[PDB]
Amino acid sequence: NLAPLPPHVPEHLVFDFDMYNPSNLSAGVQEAWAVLQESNVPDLVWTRCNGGHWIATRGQLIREAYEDYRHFSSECPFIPREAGEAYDFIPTSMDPPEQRQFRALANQVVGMPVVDKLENRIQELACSLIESLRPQGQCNFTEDYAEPFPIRIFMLLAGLPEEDIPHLKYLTDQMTRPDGSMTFAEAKEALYDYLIPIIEQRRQKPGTDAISIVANGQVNGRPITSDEAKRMCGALLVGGLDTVVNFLSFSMEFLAKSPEHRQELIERPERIPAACEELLRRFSLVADGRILTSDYEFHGVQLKKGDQILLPQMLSGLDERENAAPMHVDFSRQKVSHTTFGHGSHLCLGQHLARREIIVTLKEWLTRIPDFSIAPGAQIQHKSGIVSGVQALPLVWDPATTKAV
Ligand code: HEC
């Protein structure tokens, strides 16, 4: 539903890439985007798909525009338009130096200190979980593990009840992989009308979970209001329901067709760190944007005031000039170049936890279920969005080859 070409876009910088459904989806989801980095693709194109918008296709320009907030603002960082002008979360839809008050506060509820504390709670779900699993010879990897372990971790951290996950999940997915049952604006209010009551409770009866401390923190030098704490929370509810859980399907995905990464891991327990790093470049997955503040000429291409630019965080690490052999998985990559976690002021607050959670995951999974395969005959589907996704990942193993810890 290609938008017609704004008068100021050259016909020749036009590339019709569809970020919610790109042509080559079946190749996989990092395979479909990589088509942007092909030799017939200008560094910097426009698609008229999802309302017409720019796309930087190369690590250096993604990084660069990620660097330059005065020109490239995260006021509207979502494609489409409606979603971004809709998007208001906090710190994510701010620019320096607003952002910096609120980000520090989103950093109290999830930044390193929190992860250390949560250490054994993270350790004991990951091993509970695989153990309950390993005797069956079988799981849909998505819903058996990729979903319950980070999410339950985040409910634990947010002190939200677990009965609530299926609603919070379905609504958060409607902001990154919309079914088209509902607008973003729609998804988002509905999320807020869940939040808004808990926030109100928690400012009254102030707790030790992410929502009360966020509820009850201060910024700038005065009380955070109920309204900002609400937009403070709806980032969180997203990195916690839905970047981690997908990236997991991603990599078990991977661990499943490749004996030797599995085999190299079990006898390199300290390669796990490097491994996790490399699975971040190789299954990078987020993509969001910026809106131009002004008319601005970037790398010879006239951007105008208000135009949107997709800066796929996912691309940077996939570009053959930041890394030799982009598609090939290697564990001792001498420099894992990426922006999986973002680039700029907005560097993922949730990184340390994601990691944690990837690390333990691989250390526990390989530890008790070393050998496991794609359930057979199945072809694995991915979905494409602001957060790219795995639909379903049936896994199979001989239980004779598992280890109780
Ligand atoms: C507990 C929170 C949490 C977890 C888990 C998490 N994130 Fe984040 N992420 C955040 C928050 C909060 C921000 C906004 C911080 C700021 O504004 O400076 C953010 C920001 C981002 C950005 C910034 C992009 C933009 O608009 O610039 C990217 C990319 C990102 N996260 C990727 C991920 C990836 C990948 C994972 C999965 C492995 C993940 N996040 C897991 C909370 C999370």
Curated annotation (Swiss-Prot):
| Presence of the UniProt keyword Iron-sulfur in the record | no
Q: Which Gene Ontology molecular function entries are recorded, alphabetically?
A: camphor 5-monooxygenase activity; heme binding; iron ion binding
Q: Which UniProt keyword terms apply here?
A: Cytoplasm, Heme, Iron, Metal-binding, Monooxygenase, Oxidoreductase
Q: InterPro entries given for it?
A: Cyt_P450, Cyt_P450_B, Cyt_P450_CS, Cyt_P450_sf
* CDD domains cross-referenced by the UniProt entry: P450cam-like
An individual GO BP term:
(+)-camphor catabolic process
Entry's localization field: Cytoplasm
Involved pathway(s): Terpene metabolism; (R)-camphor degradation
This protein's GO CC annotations: cytoplasm
Q: Which Gene3D superfamilies match?
A: Cytochrome P450 (1.10.630.10)
Query: Residues that bind heme, according to the entry?
Result: C348
Q: What does this protein do?
A: Involved in a camphor oxidation system.
Q: Which family does it belong to?
A: Belongs to the cytochrome P450 family.
Protein name as catalogued: Camphor 5-monooxygenase
Q: Which gene encodes it?
A: camC
